[PDB]
Design a protein that fits this description.
This is part of a larger assembly, with 2 copies of chain A (about 425 residues), 1 copy of chain B (about 50 residues), 1 copy of chain C (about 450 residues) and 1 copy of chain D (about 300 residues). Helices cover about 45% and strands about 15% of the residues of chain A. Chain A is of the alpha/beta class and about 425 residues long. The N and C termini of chain A lie far apart (about 45 Å). In chain B, about 95% of the residues lie in helices and about 0% in strands. The N and C termini of chain B lie far apart (about 75 Å). In chain D, a hairpin with a 2-residue loop joins strand 5 and strand 6. A 4-stranded mixed sheet of chain D has the order 3-1-2-4, with no helix packed on it. The chains are: A alpha/beta (about 425), B mainly alpha (about 50), C alpha/beta (about 450), D alpha/beta (about 300). At the A-E interface, loops of A face loops of E. Bound molecules: guanosine-5'-triphosphate (GTP), guanosine-5'-diphosphate (2 copies) and magnesium ion (MG). The site of magnesium ion has 4 residues of chain C, from loops. Chain C: Keywords: GTP-binding, Hydrolase, Magnesium, Microtubule, Nucleotide-binding. Chain C: It catalyses: GTP + H2O = GDP + phosphate + H(+).
C-alpha cells in the first residue's frame, strides 16, 4: 500500500521539504539515507513511502515540479535535500509569469509529458499502489494551472486509485498578488471535478495559530510549514503503524462524504502548546478533545459556529483506552446537539494507533466536513465578480487564447457549489 | 535431520549477503572513475586558458 | 534390472546433471566413481546395477550418453566436478547448432552425427544382460532436440524393435515462450513422437514455476529447481526397480496398465509432498492427505485442468512408510469424491505400488525431508485442450507463411507442414471420440 | 569558529611542517605538503587541481615574500576563512566535514612507513569483499629525489590480496598499495616482462638467522632488473625459499571472485559430507543394530 | 567458432580500434599480446577472435583497409596499435575524393584483389568459420564504395557463411559532406541484396544519448565509438562464454527476419547511468527492461511509437532468474499490445549469459526489427531526388564512367524497400 507524493510550485516545494524532514525523522532515516533506527516497528513499513536503493539506502517516492529553478535549487541546498533522486526534479527554463493561462496552456502542455512519464515510471514500480497525495497552492501560477492539469491527467490514467489534495488558497486580508481571484476560481472549478477529497488551509489561520497559541514573537514560513507537515504526516499515520482500530484514507473518504460533490474538509491538530505553558497541563483524552474542537485551533477562516457538521473524523495516536474515546464522542454529540445534522445518527468515526509522534505521549488529528466552508468560496467569488465586470486584467488571459465563456462557466460552477452547501445547511426543516 | 537442513540454509544466506556487499562496493568504484574523468577534462581546459 | 539414459540437447543435458547428482547421492558413489564401505561382509548389494556398471578395478561408471550439437554445455560438463565419473567418449559434441531449425537437425546435420550415436548405444547394449528400456529427456521447442530426437528415435525403433522407449518431454508453455518458432518445431516433433514412443510424459515450465511459487517459498526460481524436481520424479518412478517393497511394479506394468489404445500414450505427472522445511514441522503427512494432494489441480506439472476431462486410468506410486490398508482406504475415499469422474468403461481405475525406501534429501535441495511420498501419473482426456492451443498458434503463423522460407530452403517440402497438422488434428479427434460415453450411443 | 580539537590538529600540522626551531615556514613546504586530491570540489569533480595552487599563492604570497615565511597566526586565520566558507556548504553535517577536510588536505595522521601512502582501511583488518579480488601494485620510494617529495615508482597489478598487510614488519608495509591509494602523489611507471602465469614468494628477515615469508603473492612477471638491489633480494623462487632452514609462513586465504562463477556449479554442493554419512548409515544397517530408518537394498 | 573482422575507411578503423581495446581488456590481453587474465574462463574461448602465435602471443583477426594512410598511421601510433599484424594493413596511394565512383571503379578494382587475397589467407586458417563482421559508414567515399564491393565479393566466395554489418548513415542535420545522398543511396542498394543482417546508427542519436542520458559536457568521437563497441561486443557475448540459455548470430537471424528483405535492425544498450545518479538505483531486471525500451536509449532517430515491432531480441548477461525475464517480456507485450504485430503470438526472444561486462553487475543488449526504419530511407530518398532532377554534381560521377541509368535503378530499389516496410507498418485487423 504505497503513497506517491507530488510537490508543485514554490509553496509545494517548501511544504514538501519540511514534510519529508518530519517523516524521515519519525522513521529514523539519516540525511545520508542510511537506516539508523532502533526498533523493527520502524523498519517494517518503510516501503510505504521509500523505495530501496542498493546497499542500505532509501529514496523518497516524490516528484518535484516547478517552472523556475530558484526554489528547486533552494530545496536541493537544504539539510535533507540530498536524499532526493536527481531525476525526480522537473523544471523548465522560463517562469509561469504568475499567470494561470500560461501555466495551463503554454508551459503546461510543454512540460507535462516528462512529468507524466516520471509519475508512470514511479507508479508502476509499486507492487500494489494506494492513492496519490497532492500538495499545491491555488493562488500561484504554475501551482494552480499545471497542478490541476496534472491532476486531470492522473484522473484519466488511474481512475480507480485515490486522489488526495492539500491546497493553500488566498486571503482577503493578506494577499501577495492582485490577480488572485482568477487563478483561485478556475482552480476550484478544476478541483471540484477532479479531486476525491480536498483539505483547505488559510495562511491567516496559520498566523493566528502561531501568534495566539505558540506565542511566537516573529514567526516565519518554517513554522507554518511545520504545522502543515504535522497534519499531513498525521492523516496517513494509521496506514503505516499497528493499532487497536485501524483506519485508511479510503475509509475516511467513505465515512466523511455523503454525496460526491461535498468533499471539501477543514483540519486541526490538538497538542499545540507553548514552551512556557507546557509545564502547566498534562495530556489526557478530555484535554485533547477540548483543544481539538476549539475553533481557535482550526486552519480555515470560516468558523464552525456559523455552520453545521455533516460528518467528522478523529484519528488518535497513542496507547489509550477505547472507553474514553467512545464516551467523549458521545458526550460531545449529546451536549451540543444543535450543531450536528440530525438525519445522521452518529457523525464521528474514531481510530486508534499505538505509536505517537516522537516526544508526545498522545495526539489527535481532526477532519471536519462543515458547510461554513461555503463562506470562503463566496468571498472569493465576490472579489472575482467585482474585478470581472470591468475587464480589469483580462487581455493577458485572452491573449494566451482563452475564450471569455470559460470565465462564466467557472463562475457558474463555483456558485452552484456554494448553493449546494447552503442547501444542505438549511437550518431547521419545517 | 531437518535441523541440519535449516543450518545449511542459514550458511547460504550469509554467503549471498557477502556477494551483495561486493556489488555495492563495485558501484561506488565506478562512480569514482567517472569523477576522475571529469577532473582530467577540467585540468586540460585550465591549462589552455 | 538395468536401464540406459540418453540425454539430447540443452534441456536434456542440464536435466541429466540433476538426475545423476541425485542417483549418485542416493546410492552413495563418490564423485570420482568410488564407493566407500568399511564392513568386509554384506557387500552383496546389486542395486546400483540399474544405473551403473563396475570395472574390474571397482570403479563405477553410469549408463548414459550426452548428446548435443553445440560444444559449450558438454565442455562445461567435461570441466566441472563430475569430470572423472563419465568416460570421455560418452560426452558427444558436434560443431554447430541447428539454429532453432528442425530442418537442420533432421535433414542436414543429424544424419552425420546419428551413426556415432547408434554406435555408442550399441556399445552400451553390449554391456547388458536384461535391458528393459531407454529413458529419454528432451524439449520439443528447440531445433536439435526436435530434429535429432526424432531421427534418433526412428533409428532406435527400427534397430531395437519392441524394446520400450520412455520419454520425458518439455512442451512449449501456453503463454510463456522463449523463441518465435516454437509452434512449428512442436507440431513437427509431435508428429514423429506419436509413432515412435511407448510412453510420453508431458511437462510445462509454467506449471513448475507456479508450483515452486505457491508451495515452496522461492521468489526467483531458476531451471536448477525445476530440474531437481524432475530428477526426483524420475527417481520415484525407477525406485520400484531398485529397492524392496510390498507391491513391486516393473516398467512394463506401467505401459500395460496406463495405455488403453496404442495411440493414447501421453501421461500427466504430479508429486505430493512438495513442502518447505519450515512447513514440514507444522504438518502430519498421512497417506490420505498426500493421496488427496496428487489429485488437486494445484499439484499438476502441466498446465491443464483434469476437471475438464475424464480419467481413464491412474497409477499411484507410494514410497516410504506406508501400509497397504491405508492405501486402500485412501483410494476408496478418493473414489467417493464427486469432482473425480472415471469413464464408465473403466471400473477398476487404479494401480497401486508400495516401496519402503523414503525419498532422498539432496544437500543443496529445496524440498523438505519427509517420511513418505506419493507420485502419480495418469491418462486423461483433458490433454486434448493442450494440443488445440498449439494448433491455433501454428495456424495463425502458417496462414501467412511467416517463416517457411528457412525450412523450405534447408530442404523440406512445404507439404510436410500440412501432413503433420492433419495428423495431429486426427489425434485431437481420437481424444474426442474415445471420451464419449457408451451409454449415449446405446 | 573552530573547536579545540581542530586547533590541536592545526597546531600539529604547523609544528610537523616547521623545520628548525624558527617559527617560520617556507612557501615551498606549503606547496609540497598540500594535497589537492582531497580538496572537496576536486574530489566531487568540479574544479581543476591546478586551480588550488593559484588560491594558495593568492592567500599566502603577499606575506611570504615580505616576511620570509608564514607565522602561526596567518595559518590559523587561513583556517578560520576555511571554516567560514565551509559553514555555507551543501553537506548535511559541518563539524565532521571541516575536520576530515583538514586531515585530508594537510596529509596528517598515520601513514605507511615507506613511501608514505595513506591506507584505505585499518592495516590489521583482513581485506573486505571487493578488495580481496582487485590486484594490488608494487611501489617503492625514489632516490634521486629524497623521501618526502612524494615521488614513487609503480608497477601495476602484480600482487594478490590474499594476505593481510598487518602481518608485515613496519618497514615493509608500504611496498604494496591499492590503485585507489596512489591518487595525490607523483608516479613513474615501469614495464613488465614476458612470462607465464606463475606465482612467486616474498621473504624477509626479522632477526639474525631467523626468516619469515608469505607464500605466492608476487607475479612472475615482475622484471628483476628494474627493481633496486634490496627489493629483488627479498623476492625468491618458491622451492628455494622452502629449502631455507627455520622459515615461517604468514597465513594466507584465497577468496572466491563473484564475477566469474557459473550456474552449473550449484549442483555439486555439500555432497561429500552427505555421501560419507550415507555410507556410514548403509554399513551400520548391514551390520545390524538399526531400529529406525534402515537401508532397503538387496 | 571464429569470426573475422574487416574495418574499412576512417570511421571503420576508428571504431575498430576501440572495439579491439574493449575486447582485449575483457579477455585480459596486454597490448604486447600477452595473456594477463585472472580466470581460466577468459582463456578457454580466446580462439573465437584471436589466432595463436608461437608460445603465448595473440593476434586479432582483422583486416584494416583505407585509401590514405593517415588513419592507419594514427591507429599504429595508438596504445594498442602494435597488436595488429603488419601484413593486414592495406592502403593505396591516392584518396577516394569523397566520391563513390572513385572508390568503386578506379581505386577499388586496383586494390580489391589484395584484400580478397588477405581475407582468404585469414579465412582458410580457421578450422571452422562463423560469420564475418564489417564496420563502415555509408556517407563516406572509400567506406561505401569499396566496403560494398568487398561485401559483394565475399558473398560470392562464402555464400554459406554469415554476413553481418554495422553501418553509420548520415543524419539529415549534421551534414559533414555535400554529396551524402548519392553515397547513401548506392550503398543501400548494394546492402539489400548482399547483406544478411544490417544494423543502422545515426550519429545524431548518439549525441542525443550522450547529452540526455549521460549529460556529458564535452563529448568526443571516443564516446560514440565506445557506445558502438559496447553493442558490437555484446551481440557476440553468448558466442564466447557459458550461459543458461545459449544463443548465436544464426539463431538471432532465424528468429528476427520473417522475410528475407526485412533484415535491417535497431540497436540499444540499457545500463547507461548518469555520472551523478548511480548511488540512487540498483541494477535489476525491471530497471533494465524499462530502460531498454525507452526511446531515449535507442540509436536511431526514428521512434518506435510511430511504428510497430515485428520481432525483438534481448541478450542478458549475468546470474539472474529466467522467471523474471519471461514474465517481464510477457507483461510488456500484453500491456502495450497495439504496438506488436498481431499475427505472431510472441514477438520477443530472450537469452541469458552468465558473464557480465567488467564493472557492471548486469547488462542487456537489444535488437529490434521495426518499420520506423522506413523514415530514415524516405528522408535520404527525398534529399537524393531534389538534387538529381537538376544534375547538381553529377559530372564528377559521369566523368568517372557511371551511366545515369544507375541512379534511377538505385532510387527505384530504395523506394520499393520503403514500400515493403510501409505495407507491414500500416496493416490493421480487417
Ligand atoms: N526445465 C528446463 N527447460 C529448459 C532448460 N533450458 C531450456 N529449456 C526449455 O527448452 C526449450 C528450449 O530448448 P533448448 O534445449 O534450448 O533447445 P536445444 O536443445 O538447445 O536446441 P538448439 O537451440 O538447436 O541447440 C524452451 O522451452 C526452454 O524453456 C532447462 O535448463 N530446464
Ligand atoms: N503557508 C505557506 N504559504 C506560502 C509559502 N510559500 C508561498 N506561500 C504563499 O503562496 C502564494 C504564492 O504562491 P507561489 O507558491 O509562489 O506560486 P508559484 O510561483 O506557482 O510557486 C502567496 O500567497 C504566498 O504567501 C509557504 O511556504 N507556506
Ligand atoms: N560516430 C563516428 N562517426 C564518424 C567518425 N569519424 C567520422 N565519422 C563520420 O563519418 C562521416 C565521414 O565519413 P568518413 O569515415 O570520413 O568516410 P571515408 O573518408 O570514406 O573514410 C561524417 O559524417 C563523420 O561525422 C567516428 O570516429 N565516429
Ligand atoms: Mg540450443
Amino acid at each position: 500500500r504505497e503513497i506517491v507524493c507530488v510537490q508543485a510550485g514554490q509553496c509545494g516545494n517548501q511544504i514538501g521539504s519540511k514534510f519529508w524532514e518530519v517523516i524521515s525523522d519519525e522513521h529514523g532515516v539519516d540525511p545520508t539515507g542510511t537506516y539508523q533506527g532502533d526498533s523493527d516497528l520502524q523498519l517494517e513499513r518503510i516501503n510505504v513511502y521509500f523505495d530501496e536503493a542498493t546497499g542500505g539506502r532509501y529514496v523518497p517516492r516524490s516528484v518535484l515540479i516547478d517552472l523556475e529553478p530558484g526554489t528547486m535549487d533552494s530545496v536541493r541546498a537544504g539539510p535533507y535535500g540530498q536524499i532526493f533522486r536527481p531525476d525526480n526534479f522537473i523544471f523548465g527554463q522560463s517562469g509561469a509569469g504568475n499567470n494561470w493561462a500560461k501555466g495551463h496552456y503554454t508551459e503546461g502542455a510543454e512540460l507535462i509529458d516528462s512529468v507524466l512519464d516520471v509519475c508512470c515510471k514511479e507508479a508502476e514500480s509499486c507492487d500494489c499502489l494506494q492513492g496519490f497525495q497532492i500538495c499545491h497552492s491555488l493562488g500561484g501560477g504554475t501551482g494552480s494551472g499545471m497542478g490541476t492539469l496534472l491532476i486531470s491527467k492522473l484522473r484519466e490514467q488511474y481512475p480507480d486509485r485515490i486522489m488526495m489534495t492539500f491546497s493553500i488558497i488566498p486571503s482577503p486580508k493578506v494577499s501577495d498578488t492582485v490577480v488572485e481571484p482568477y487563478n483561485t476560481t478556475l482552480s476550484v472549478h478544476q478541483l471540484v471535478e477532479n479531486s476525491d477529497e480536498s483539505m483547505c488551509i488559510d495562511n491567516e489561520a496559520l498566523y493566528d495559530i502561531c501568534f495566539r497559541t505558540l506565542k511566537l514573537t516573529t514567526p516565519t514560513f518554517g513554522d507554518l510549514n511545520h504545522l502543515v507537515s504535522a497534519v499531513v504526516s498525521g492523516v496517513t499515520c494509521c496506514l503505516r503503524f499497528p493499532g487497536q482500530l485501524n483506519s485508511d484514507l479510503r475509509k475516511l473518504a467513505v465515512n466523511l462524504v455523503p454525496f460526491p460533490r461535498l468533499h471539501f474538509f477543514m483540519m486541526g491538530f490538538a497538542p499545540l502548546t507553548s514552551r512556557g505553558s507546557q509545564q502547566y497541563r498534562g495530556l489526557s483524552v478530555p484535554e485533547l478533545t477540548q483543544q481539538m474542537f476549539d475553533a481557535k485551533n482550526m486552519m480555515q477562516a470560516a468558523d464552525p459556529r456559523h455552520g453545521r457538521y455533516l460528518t467528522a473524523s478523529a484519528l488518535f495516536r497513542g496507547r489509550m483506552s477505547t472507553k474514553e474515546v467512545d464516551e467523549q464522542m458521545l458526550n460531545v454529540q449529546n451536549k451540543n446537539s444543535s450543531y450536528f445534522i440530525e438525519w445522521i445518527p452518529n457523525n464521528i468515526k474514531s481510530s486508534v494507533c499505538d505509536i505517537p509522534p516522537k516526544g508526545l505521549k498522545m495526539a489527535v488529528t481532526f477532519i471536519g466536513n462543515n458547510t461554513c466552508i461555503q463562506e470562503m468560496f463566496r468571498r472569493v467569488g465576490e472579489q472575482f465578480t467585482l474585478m470581472f465586470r470591468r475587464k480589469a486584467f483580462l487581455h493577458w488571459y485572452t491573449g494566451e487564447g482563452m475564450d471569455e465563456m470559460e470565465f462564466t462557466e467557472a463562475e457558474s460552477n463555483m456558485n452552484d457549489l456554494v448553493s449546494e452547501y447552503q442547501q444542505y445547511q438549511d437550518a431547521t426543516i419545517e | 535431520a531437518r535441523f541440519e537442513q535449516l543450518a545449511l540454509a542459514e550458511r547460504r544466506k550469509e554467503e549471498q549477503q557477502r556477494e551483495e556487499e561486493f556489488f555495492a562496493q563495485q558501484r561506488v568504484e565506478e562512480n569514482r572513475l567517472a569523477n576522475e574523468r571529469a577532473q582530467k577534462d577540467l585540468e586540460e581546459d585550465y591549462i589552455r586558458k | 534390472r538395468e536401464a540406459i539414459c540418453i540425454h539430447i540437447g540443452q534441456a536434456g543435458c542440464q536435466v541429466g546433471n540433476a538426475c545423476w547428482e541425485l542417483f549418485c547421492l542416493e546410492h552413495g558413489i563418490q564423485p570420482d566413481g568410488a564407493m566407500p564401505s568399511d564392513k568386509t561382509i554384506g557387500v552383496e548389494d546389486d542395486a546400483f546395477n540399474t544405473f551403473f556398471s563396475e570395472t574390474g578395478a571397482g570403479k563405477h561408471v553410469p549408463r548414459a550418453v550426452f548428446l548435443d550439437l553445440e560444444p559449450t554445455v558438454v565442455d562445461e560438463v567435461r570441466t566441472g566436478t563430475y569430470r572423472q565419473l563419465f568416460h570421455p567418449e560418452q560426452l558427444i559434441s558436434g560443431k554447430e547448432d541447428a539454429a532453432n531449425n528442425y530442418a537442420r537437425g533432421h535433414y542436414t546435420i543429424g544424419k552425420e552425427i546419428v551413426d556415432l550415436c547408434l554406435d555408442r548405444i550399441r556399445k552400451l547394449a553390449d554391456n547388458c544382460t536384461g535391458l528393459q528400456g531407454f529413458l529419454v529427456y528432451h524439449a520439443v521447442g528447440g531445433g536439435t532436440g526436435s530434429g535429432l530426437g526424432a531421427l534418433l528415435l526412428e533409428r532406435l525403433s527400427v534397430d531395437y524393435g519392441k524394446k520400450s522407449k520412455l520419454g520425458y518431454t518439455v512442451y512449449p508453455s501456453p503463454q510463456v515462450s522463449t523463441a518465435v518458432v516454437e509452434p512449428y518445431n512442436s507440431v513437427l516433433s509431435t508428429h514423429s513422437l506419436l509413432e515412435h514412443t511407448d510412453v510420453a510424459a508431458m511437462l510445462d515450465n509454467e506449471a513448475i514455476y507456479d508450483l515452486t511459487r505457491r508451495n515452496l517459498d522461492i521468489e526467483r526460481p531458476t531451471y536448477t529447481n525445476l530440474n531437481r524436481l524432475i530428477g526426483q520424479v524420475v527417481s520415484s518412478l525407477t525406485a520400484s526397480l531398485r529397492f524392496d517393497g510390498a507391491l513391486n511394479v516393473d516398467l512394463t506394468e506401467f505401459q500395460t496398465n496406463l495405455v488403453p489404445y496404442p495411440r493414447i500414450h501421453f501421461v500427466l505427472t504430479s508429486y505430493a509432498p512438495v513442502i518447505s522445511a519450515e512447513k514440514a514441522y507444522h504438518e502430519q503427512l498421512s497417506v490420505s492427505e498426500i493421496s488427496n494432494a496428487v489429485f488437486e489441480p494445484a499439484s499438476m506439472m502441466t498446465k491443464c485442468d483434469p476437471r475438464h476431462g475424464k480419467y481413464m486410468a491412474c497409477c499411484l506410486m507410494y514410497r516410504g512408510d506406508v501400509v497397504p490398508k491405508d492405501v486402500n482406504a485412501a483410494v476408496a475415499t478418493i473414489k467417493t469424491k464427486r469432482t473425480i469422474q472415471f469413464v464408465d468403461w473403466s471400473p477398476t481405475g487404479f494401480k497401486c505400488g508400495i516401496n519402503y525406501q523414503p525419498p532422498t534429501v539432496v544437500p543443496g535441495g529445496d524440498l523438505a525431508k519427509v517420511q513418505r511420498a506419493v507420485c502419480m501419473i495418469a491418462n486423461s482426456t483433458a490433454i486434448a485442450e493442450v494440443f488445440a492451443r498449439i494448433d491455433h498458434k501454428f495456424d495463425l503463423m502458417y496462414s501467412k507463411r511467416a517463416f517457411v522460407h528457412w525450412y523450405v530452403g534447408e530442404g523440406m517440402e512445404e507439404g510436410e507442414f500440412s501432413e503433420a497438422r492433419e495428423d495431429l488434428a486426427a489425434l485431437e479427434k481420437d481424444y474426442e471420440e474415445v471420451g464419449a460415453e457408451s451409454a449415449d450411443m446405446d | 569558529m573552530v573547536t579545540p580539537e581542530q586547533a590541536a590538529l592545526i597546531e600539529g600540522a604547523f609544528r610537523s611542517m616547521d623545520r628548525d626551531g624558527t617559527g617560520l615556514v617556507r612557501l615551498e613546504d606549503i606547496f609540497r605538503v598540500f594535497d589537492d586530491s582531497r580538496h572537496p570540489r576536486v574530489r566531487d569533480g568540479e574544479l581543476a587541481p591546478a586551480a588550488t595552487r593559484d588560491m594558495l599563492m593568492h592567500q599566502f604570497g603577499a606575506t611570504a615574500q615580505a616576511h620570509g615565511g608564514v607565522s602561526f597566526d596567518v595559518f590559523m586565520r587561513f583556517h578560520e576563512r576555511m571554516a567560514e566558507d565551509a559553514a555555507v556548504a551543501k553537506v548535511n553535517d559541518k563539524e565532521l566535514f571541516l575536520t576530515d577536510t583538514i586531515i585530508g588536505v594537510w596529509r596528517l595522521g598515520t601513514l605507511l612507513q615507506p613511501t608514505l601512502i595513506r591506507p584505505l582501511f585499518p592495516v590489521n583488518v583482513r581485506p573486505s569483499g571487493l578488495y580481496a579480488t582487485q590486484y594490488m601494485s608494487l611501489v617503492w620510494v625514489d632516490e634521486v629525489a629524497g623521501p618526502g617529495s612524494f615521488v614513487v615508482h609503480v608497477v601495476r597489478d602484480v600482487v594478490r590480496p590474499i594476505f593481510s598487510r598487518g602481518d608485515l614488519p613496519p618497514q615493509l608495509r608500504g611496498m604494496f598499495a591499492y590503485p585507489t591509494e596512489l591518487a595525490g602523489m607523483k608516479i613513474i611507471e615501469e614495464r613488465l616482462q614476458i612470462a607465464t602465469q606463475r606465482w612467486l614468494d616474498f621473504v624477509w628477515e626479522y632477526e639474525e638467522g631467523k626468516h619469515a615469508a608469505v607464500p605466492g603473492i608476487i607475479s612472475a612477471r615482475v622484471d628483476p632488473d628494474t627493481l633496486p638491489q634490496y627489493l629483488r633480494d627479498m623476492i625468491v623462487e618458491h622451492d628455494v625459499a622452502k629449502a631455507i632452514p627455520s622459515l615461517f609462513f604468514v597465513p594466507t586465504s584465497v577468496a572466491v571472485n563473484p564475477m566469474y562463477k557459473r550456474s552449473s556449479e550449484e549442483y555439486g554442493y555439500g555432497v561429500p559430507e552427505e555421501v560419507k554419512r550415507m555410507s556410514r548409515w548403509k554399513d551400520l544397517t548391514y551390520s545390524g543394530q538399526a531400529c529406525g530408518l534402515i537401508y532397503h537394498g538387496r
